[PDB]
Write an enzyme that holds these catalytic residues in place. Structure first.
Site, short mmCIF file in Angstrom:
data_model
loop_
_atom_site.label_atom_id
_atom_site.label_comp_id
_atom_site.label_asym_id
_atom_site.label_seq_id
_atom_site.Cartn_x
_atom_site.Cartn_y
_atom_site.Cartn_z
N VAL B 111 0.81 -1.20 0.00
CA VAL B 111 0.00 0.00 0.00
C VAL B 111 0.85 1.27 0.00
CG1 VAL B 111 -1.64 1.34 1.49
CG2 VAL B 111 -1.96 -1.13 1.14
N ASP B 113 3.70 1.93 -1.33
CA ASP B 113 4.56 2.13 -2.51
C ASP B 113 4.39 3.63 -2.85
OD1 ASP B 113 4.19 2.44 -5.79
OD2 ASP B 113 5.84 1.19 -5.13
N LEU B 116 1.76 4.19 -5.85
CA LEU B 116 0.37 3.90 -5.53
C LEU B 116 -0.21 4.85 -4.49
CD1 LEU B 116 0.31 -0.07 -5.67
CD2 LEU B 116 0.07 1.61 -7.49
N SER B 117 0.47 5.01 -3.36
CA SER B 117 -0.05 5.89 -2.32
C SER B 117 0.01 7.35 -2.74
CB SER B 117 0.70 5.67 -0.99
OG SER B 117 2.07 6.04 -1.08
N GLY B 118 1.03 7.67 -3.55
CA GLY B 118 1.16 9.03 -4.11
C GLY B 118 0.00 9.40 -5.03
N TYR B 120 -2.97 9.47 -4.38
CA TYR B 120 -4.03 10.14 -3.66
C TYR B 120 -3.84 11.67 -3.65
CZ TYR B 120 -5.96 5.54 -2.55
OH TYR B 120 -6.46 4.24 -2.68
N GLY B 189 -12.11 -14.72 -10.02
CA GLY B 189 -11.04 -13.80 -9.55
C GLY B 189 -10.24 -14.56 -8.48
N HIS B 250 -15.90 -5.49 -3.97
CA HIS B 250 -15.59 -4.16 -3.42
C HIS B 250 -14.62 -3.38 -4.31
CE1 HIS B 250 -11.55 -4.89 -1.12
NE2 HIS B 250 -11.63 -5.72 -2.15
N1 LIG Z 1 -12.14 -9.30 -15.89
C1 LIG Z 1 -11.70 -10.13 -14.97
N2 LIG Z 1 -11.93 -11.46 -15.01
C2 LIG Z 1 -11.47 -12.34 -14.06
N3 LIG Z 1 -10.71 -12.00 -12.99
C3 LIG Z 1 -10.46 -10.67 -12.91
C4 LIG Z 1 -10.88 -9.69 -13.79
N4 LIG Z 1 -10.46 -8.44 -13.43
C5 LIG Z 1 -9.80 -8.61 -12.37
N5 LIG Z 1 -9.75 -9.95 -11.97
C6 LIG Z 1 -9.08 -10.19 -10.84
O1 LIG Z 1 -9.65 -10.18 -9.50
C7 LIG Z 1 -8.57 -10.24 -8.44
C8 LIG Z 1 -8.87 -10.24 -7.59
S1 LIG Z 1 -7.73 -9.53 -6.13
C9 LIG Z 1 -7.28 -11.15 -5.47
C10 LIG Z 1 -8.45 -12.01 -5.24
C11 LIG Z 1 -8.51 -13.33 -4.63
N6 LIG Z 1 -9.97 -13.81 -4.64
C12 LIG Z 1 -8.05 -13.26 -3.26
O2 LIG Z 1 -8.92 -13.21 -2.34
O3 LIG Z 1 -6.79 -13.18 -3.11
C13 LIG Z 1 -7.23 -10.40 -9.20
O4 LIG Z 1 -6.74 -11.76 -9.07
C14 LIG Z 1 -7.64 -10.07 -10.60
O5 LIG Z 1 -6.78 -10.62 -11.58
C1 LIG Z 2 -8.95 -7.14 -3.92
O1 LIG Z 2 -8.94 -6.51 -2.72
C2 LIG Z 2 -8.23 -5.31 -2.50
C3 LIG Z 2 -8.21 -4.71 -1.20
C4 LIG Z 2 -7.46 -3.52 -0.90
C5 LIG Z 2 -6.71 -2.92 -1.98
C6 LIG Z 2 -5.90 -1.71 -1.68
O2 LIG Z 2 -5.89 -1.24 -0.49
C7 LIG Z 2 -5.12 -1.16 -2.86
C8 LIG Z 2 -4.25 0.00 -2.62
C9 LIG Z 2 -4.76 1.25 -2.08
C10 LIG Z 2 -3.91 2.34 -1.86
C11 LIG Z 2 -2.43 2.19 -2.19
O3 LIG Z 2 -1.62 3.14 -2.02
C12 LIG Z 2 -1.92 0.98 -2.72
C13 LIG Z 2 -2.77 -0.11 -2.94
C14 LIG Z 2 -5.22 -1.77 -4.11
O4 LIG Z 2 -6.01 -2.92 -4.38
C15 LIG Z 2 -6.71 -3.46 -3.34
C16 LIG Z 2 -7.47 -4.65 -3.59
#
Ligand SMILES: Nc1ncnc2c1ncn2[C@@H]1O[C@@H](CSCC[C@H](N)C(=O)O)[C@@H](O)[C@H]1O
Ligand SMILES: COc1ccc2c(=O)c(-c3ccc(O)cc3)coc2c1
Ligand SMILES: Nc1ncnc2c1ncn2[C@@H]1O[C@@H](CSCC[C@H](N)C(=O)O)[C@@H](O)[C@H]1O
Ligand SMILES: COc1ccc2c(=O)c(-c3ccc(O)cc3)coc2c1
Lengths: 345, 345
Positions: B111, B113, B116-118, B120, B189, B250
């Site tokens: 988070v 990095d 990524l955080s920049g 915002y 996913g 989410h």
């Molecule tokens: N169009 C799409 N089809 C299928 N998977 C997708 C997608 N867009 C994003 N995803 C994905 O959804 C993710 C989910 S974040 C990781 C999720 C995993 N269920 C866990 O709990 O660790 C990533 O793996 C990402 O590749």
């Molecule tokens: C799939 O579930 C998630 C849950 C939390 C995050 C998350 O918190 C960030 C994130 C937010 C701010 C940052 O600076 C860096 C990364 C990116 O993807 C995500 C996916």
């Protein structure tokens, strides 16, 4: 590994991992000009009127509401609910309204510049540097040289320093004990003369020299008793009956403060005279200050990594004064977070 | 303009302007490996032993002490004073110790990095975009495409997702009501199959398909009942008796969630069957949750601006389920901040 006290510790860790959102959401409110929009509205503003004025796309209206509620819970707005949800200013967001008595919005914008605030990602590289300041590590030059090369940054920094200037400068000029008997004073690191002008308006017969780096005072014009001198405080400070150091010493290590204090002592002890040095900066006091106040001072101390600076407690101040050859000192409260310290050679 | 309530409001404003230091100081402690150094020491560590192990220059030792005390006041270390000042772990910093039961240090690093955080810093540009997510504005492509092009970022993100996986996945496999009677399940996913492997270890006769983008599951090999399928959940999800969505919904707007939910409904209603969809994500509940818990959920909701995501309350979840054509739903607590939601077509 314990019981469900893990969920509680997880909540604490998350609060801190994402604490930067508190800073970025506040920056967002100032950049969107929300405090002024509400002030100009004259009453709490409805979400629909707010997004109408902002002209945000409908797909982001809910995001404006989510950010407003987050800022309100933090204390920057008061939510009033009737037919609609409305947002009112609070004393804290009144500090962000232009032309309000004390407006600190320029401080929010200066500090939260991406490059400057982003420098804190490099605390590890900096802690391994024998000499570089945090900004020195990230900007590639010292901070003052950096401002000289980057006008927009110099403007932003000056506006930020100006933002609490009236309050401090008026508290200073109301201190008769500082000015009684002086015929001359030099404001070391005096900037563009903001403090000196208030001093001269108050004491029309006092000679005041604004002393700062050549690029800062170039092309500035003084008038009747107020003059500008370009120089280096580590090399030579003009003689005067007293030296003022406002927000200077907290920007330097103890070693550098000793160098500055020696040059100030020289400036007020020329031709057999025995003048003094007046300092305006924080004084940490864990046992006297209210906890909330101590916490902000401790937080500013950590923030000073930017210039290898420090916010000092009384024993730290005393040790510097003694090592620089001053015989005694006096500390008085000045205004808000700041103290007035006088040191005698 | 009021009385000395101005100083109090100023303290609040400063706390928020500099809140990013809470995030950067925590990042610094993890990068310096302090939690593990203390764990390996077996007792609270003295400042002198700590800076000896770190090998920081003597000119920065005081800065290490100032940062440690700031982190301790925040709850990440306990200061013990005897002949020297020593630092002990707390339940919160035990969450940062490698090989500890639940280690979230990879989440801190991911988070925080700088890029990524920049991102915002650009909340204003993003609030004016009709369609782009915050990361879309700053990275120049959508987040998933970005991970495909940047291996180190993909690794960091996967390690972060893995960090609380054991806890959630074990809570899920302990839910018999979810798995009773199933002959097949597709984890939509599903990543690299972390959840599916635990599911298969628990239910050896259950067929499990890990479904994710082609680049994510390429070259992954399954085994007895566990297979990988590369695809796009917005286009076609493999048929199964049930679909799992862990930390998926989410990350998407209501409009995109409706698209995903329609494809899931299709996948569990083929050939006259009437399966179900199981969702793992937060459920905001201001009246039932402890305030501290509600505050973290609200904070995660604001953080989801990164992907135009959202953390939803029960009425928001219900409205999506109904609009996607599901007939009823059930919510159960799962673990920590997460709920288990089941929806029936
Ligand atoms: N169009 C799409 N089809 C299928 N998977 C997708 C997608 N867009 C994003 N995803 C994905 O959804 C993710 C989910 S974040 C990781 C999720 C995993 N269920 C866990 O709990 O660790 C990533 O793996 C990402 O590749
Ligand atoms: C799939 O579930 C998630 C849950 C939390 C995050 C998350 O918190 C960030 C994130 C937010 C701010 C940052 O600076 C860096 C990364 C990116 O993807 C995500 C996916
Ligand atoms: N070597 C040096 N000699 C003189 N002034 C210096 C200096 N190095 C830095 N300064 C300066 O010290 C500053 C102080 S910050 C602003 C200070 C001003 N007293 C105020 O209260 O607004 C800058 O103006 C800066 O140019
Ligand atoms: C002379 O008195 C001061 C007082 C405070 C600051 C200050 O707070 C910063 C700063 C810190 C972090 C940032 O991100 C940006 C700017 C720079 O110089 C200063 C000088």
């Amino acid at each position: 590994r314990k019981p469900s006290e893990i969920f509680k510790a997880q909540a604490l860790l998350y609060k801190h991992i994402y604490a930067f959102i508190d800073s970025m959401s506040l920056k967002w409110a100032v950049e969107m000009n929300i405090p002024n929009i509400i002030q100009n509205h004259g009453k709490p503003i409805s979400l629909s009127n707010l997004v109408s004025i902002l002209q945000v796309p409908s797909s982001k209206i809910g995001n404006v509401r989510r950010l407003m509620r987050y800022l309100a819970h933090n204390g920057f707005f008061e939510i009033i609910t009737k037919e609609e949800e409305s947002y009112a200013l609070t004393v804290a967001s009144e500090l962000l309204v232009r032309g309000s008595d004390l407006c600190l919005a320029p401080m929010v914008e200066c500090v939260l510049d991406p490059t400057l605030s982003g420098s804190y990602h490099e605390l590890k590289k900096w802690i391994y540097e024998e000499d570089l300041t945090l900004f020195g590590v990230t900007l590639g030059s010292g901070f003052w040289d950096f401002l000289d090369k980057n006008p927009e940054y110099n403007t932003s920094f000056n506006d930020a320093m100006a933002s609490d200037s009236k309050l401090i400068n008026l508290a200073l000029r109301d201190c008769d004990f500082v000015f009684d008997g002086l015929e001359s004073i030099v404001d070391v690191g005096g900037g563009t003369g903001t403090t000196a002008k208030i001093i001269c308006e108050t004491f029309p017969k006092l000679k005041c020299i604004v002393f700062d780096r050549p690029q800062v005072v170039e092309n500035l014009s003084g008038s009747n008793n107020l003059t500008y001198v370009g120089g280096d405080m580590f090399t030579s400070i003009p003689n005067a009956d007293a030296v003022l150091l406002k927000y200077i010493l907290h920007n330097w290590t103890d070693k550098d403060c000793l160098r500055i204090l020696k040059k100030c002592k020289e400036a007020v002890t020329n031709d057999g005279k025995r003048g003094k040095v007046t300092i305006i900066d924080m004084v940490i006091d864990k046992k006297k200050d209210e906890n909330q106040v101590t916490q902000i001072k401790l937080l500013m101390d950590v923030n000073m990594a930017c210039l290898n600076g420090k916010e000092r407690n009384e024993e730290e101040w005393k040790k510097l004064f003694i090592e620089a050859g001053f015989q005694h000192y006096k500390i008085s409260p000045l205004t808000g977070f700041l103290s007035l310290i006088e040191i005698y050679p």
